[PDB]
Amino acid sequence: MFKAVLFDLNGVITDTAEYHFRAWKALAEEIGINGVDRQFNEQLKGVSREDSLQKILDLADKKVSAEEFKELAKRKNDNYVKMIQDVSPADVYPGILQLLKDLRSNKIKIALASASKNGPFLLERMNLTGYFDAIADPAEVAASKPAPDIFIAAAHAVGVAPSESIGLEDSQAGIQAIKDSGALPIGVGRPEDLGDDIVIVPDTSHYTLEFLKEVWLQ
Ligand SMILES: O=P(O)(O)OC[C@H]1O[C@@H](OP(=O)(O)O)[C@H](O)[C@@H](O)[C@@H]1O
Ligand SMILES: [Mg+2]
C-alpha cells in the first residue's frame, strides 16, 4: 500500500497554463521575439520560470545580462500573478477536493511537487493548504521536470521514499520526473501524450482513492 501521493499543481489540482502562456507571449512580444505560440508553450509544462525564459531567449538567440534576465522573469511573473487574482475554490478540478479528503481520512500523506513558486498562493486561494503535509519548494531543487528532484523532495518531505508513493501528473516532463524518481505515475490526459506503459485517466474525476489503490496492484 502506497504511503503518499505527490501532486503536480497545474493540470491536476487546477490549471493556470493559459495565464502562463499569455504572460510569456506578452513578454516575448515586448522584447522582439517571435515564436512564443501555443505549440511552443506546450513544451513549458512543468518547466521552471528560469528555464522557460531561457527557452524563449533561445528562439531569437538573444543574449541578456544576468540582471536583465532577472528583470524579465520578474516582469512576466508580476503579470502572471495579476492574471490569477480571482482564483478561488471554484477552480479546483473535479474529484480533487474529495481525493484530498479521502487520502487524509485514510492517513495517506499529501505533498505538492509543482515547479511553480506560485504553488502556495494558489493552494491558499483554493482553500487547500490544510490538506498538504508538505510543499516541495521549487527554489530549493536543482532541476526542472523531467528531472526527478522535485518528486524526490516531495516524498522525502512527508517521510517516505518515492517508491512508496503515487505521483499524479499531466505533462510528459512530469511523467518522466515521476518515473525517474521511482514513484508510480498515473497520468491525466491522453495515452498519446503521456505514454502507453502507464495508467492514464481521461480527467481528474477518475482520480479516486479506490482507483489509486486498485492501480497500486495492477
Ligand atoms: O514559478 P512559476 O513561474 O510560478 O511557474 C513555473 C512553472 O510551474 C509549472 O507548474 P506545475 O509543475 O505543472 O504545477 C507550470 O506547468 C509551468 O508552465 C511554469 O512555468
Ligand atoms: Mg503540471
Q: Specify which residues 111 forms β-bridges with.
A: 6, 134
Q: For the purposes of burial, counting CB atoms within 10 Å of the CB of 24, is it exposed (0-12), middle (13-18) or buried (19 or more)? A: buried
Contact residues for 22 (Cβ-Cβ < 8 A; gap 6+): 79, 83
Could you tell me the end-to-end alpha-carbon distance of the chain, in angstroms, rounded to an integer?
12
Quote the cell numbers at residue 133: 503535509
Shared domain check, 75 and 26:
yes
Shared domain check, 215 and 186:
yes
Expressed in angstroms and rounded, the spacing between residue 162 Cα and the centre of ligand 1 is 21
Shared domain check, 1 and 22:
no
CB 9 within 8 A of CB 112: yes
Q: Is the CB of 8 under 6 A from ligand 1?
A: yes
Q: In this structure, is the dihedral angle defined by the CA atoms of residues 75, 135, 100 and 198, taken in order, positive or negative? A: positive
Quote the cell numbers at residue 20: 502562463
Q: From the CB of residue 172, how many other CB atoms can be counted at a distance below 10 Å? A: 19
Helix 49-59 vs helix 66-83: angle between axes, to the nearest 10 degrees?
Answer: 110
Interior angle at CA 15, CA 3 and CA 60, nearest 5: 115
Residue 62 carries which side chain, given as an amino acid letter? Answer: K
Residue at grid coordinates 505515475: 185
- Which one-letter DSSP state was computed for residue 55? H
CA distances from 172 to 77, 80, 149, 190, 194 (A): 24, 23, 15, 11, 5
Residue at grid coordinates 505533498: 111
Peptide bond into 120 cis (omega under 30): no
Shared domain check, 64 and 41:
yes
Distance from C-alpha of 50 to C-alpha of 195, rounded to nearest angstrom:
27
Distance from C-alpha of 27 to C-alpha of 56, rounded to nearest angstrom:
9
Q: In this structure, is the dihedral angle defined by the CA atoms of residues 124, 125, 131 and 134, taken in order, positive or negative? A: negative
Helices first, then strands: H and E counts in the chain: 10, 6
Interior angle at CA 142, CA 18 and CA 113, nearest 5: 50
Quote the cell numbers at residue 102: 479521502
Residue that finishes a domain, picked among 92, 116, 131:
92
Contact residues for 4 (Cβ-Cβ < 8 A; gap 6+): 108, 109, 110, 111, 154, 155, 158, 160, 164, 165, 166
Q: Tell me the structure's resolution in angstroms, rounded to a single decimal.
A: 1.9
Number of domains in the chain: 2
Q: Is the CB of 10 under 6 A from ligand 1?
A: yes
Identify how the structure was determined.
X-ray
Distance of CA 150 to the CA centre of its chain: 10
Q: What is the span of the domain harbouring residue 119? A: 1-14+93-218
Pocket-testing residue among 44, 83, 116, 122, ligand 1, by greatest number of atoms within 8 A of Cβ: 116
CATH number at residue 72: 1.10.150.240
Q: Is the CB of 53 under 6 A from ligand 1?
A: no
Q: Specify which residues 200 forms β-bridges with.
A: 187
Shared domain check, 197 and 99:
yes
Contact residues for 17 (Cβ-Cβ < 8 A; gap 6+): 10, 11, 41, 45
